[PDB]
Write a protein that binds this ligand. Structure first.
Ligand code: 1NQ
Ligand code: ZN
Length: 274
């Protein structure tokens, strides 16, 4: 350091960074048409009427859900795969994976767009869960998300064929532990050679501490509206910030990498398929 974005693009082009750990949050999917839930006016938590919620947290609370699962299932029908499309940020991470450089992608999002973009499940830590599978709330039988799709789209509350309990998509609700796959962090963070943080400032724990868990010389590259959170509170000499609009930050890195044409082709193939 002091490193630039171009310096990092060169280390990626040289394949000196081949165990990239990526952490992403809400800021990467606003260009797909999903506002952060906290956005005034447009965000889930400011639209209690269209979900029929009595206060915003209730949508991810287990006792409310048991009392009335319909608000959560309205969200599930909106966020279920096929409604929103990944954007260039997600396709960039797909390209990182197709090139052999992605160790893990840790996502705070529940929109499932990393998996839609074609990154395999084994590369993802969906830290707040996923619509891609569901579990009986009573007997714990697992179901593929496709298996409750028809119910979700027809506004029926899916039921378990063994015990008749309600079947809930595998979103982690308030107060529940993170998914067991979260503890891959123990193995992945000491091993990362490049930490890439997109569309989140990682203020909330246990994510916040993870930013310090990479080794001393690992570059940490933040592509985010602003430099806040733990990278700001405790800067390291190989940190890079690319601020402002995350799509422009990522298009800029894609060009420095020489992947712009390869990105255009990938986005054409995929949005074809969708
Ligand atoms: C420490 C043990 N458990 C925990 O720390 C937690 C368990 C459950 C937690 C929780 O917040 N559950 C609700 C799901 C979250 C998903 C991400 N989230 C978001 N907030 C704001 N905007 C967005 C946008 C999202 C998207 N685009 O998918 S997710 C999300 C907050 C609710 S936090
Ligand atoms: Zn059951």
């Amino acid at each position: 350091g002091k490193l630039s974005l171009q310096d990092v693009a060169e280390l990626i082009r040289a394949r000196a960074c081949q165990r990239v750990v990526v952490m992403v949050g809400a800021g990467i999917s606003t260009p797909s048409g999903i506002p952060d839930f906290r956005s005034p006016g447009s965000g889930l938590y400011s639209n209690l009427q269209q979900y029929d919620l009595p206060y915003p947290e209730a949508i991810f609370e287990l006792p409310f859900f048991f009392h009335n699962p319909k608000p959560f299932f309205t969200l599930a029908k909106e966020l279920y795969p096929g409604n929103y499309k990944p954007n260039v940020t997600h396709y960039f991470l797909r390209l990182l994976h197709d090139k052999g450089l992605l160790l893990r992608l840790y996502t705070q999002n529940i929109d499932g767009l990393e998996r839609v973009s074609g990154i395999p499940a084994s590369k993802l830590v969906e830290a707040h869960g996923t619509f891609a599978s569901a579990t009986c709330t009573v007997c714990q039988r697992p179901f593929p998300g496709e298996d409750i799709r028809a119910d979700v789209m027809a506004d029926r509350v899916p039921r378990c064929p063994v015990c008749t309990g309600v079947v809930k998509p595998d979103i982690v609700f308030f107060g529940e532990p993170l998914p067991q796959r979260f503890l891959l962090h123990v193995v992945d963070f000491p091993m990362a050679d490049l930490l890439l943080i997109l569309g989140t400032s990682l203020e909330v724990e246990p994510f916040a501490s993870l930013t310090e868990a990479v080794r001393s010389s690992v570059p940490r590259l933040l592509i985010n509206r602003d430099l806040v959170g733990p990278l700001a509170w405790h800067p390291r000499s190989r940190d890079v910030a690319q601020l402002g609009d995350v799509v422009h930050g990522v298009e800029s890195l894609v060009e420095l990498l020489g992947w712009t044409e390869e990105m255009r082709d990938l986005v054409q193939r995929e949005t074809g398929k969708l």
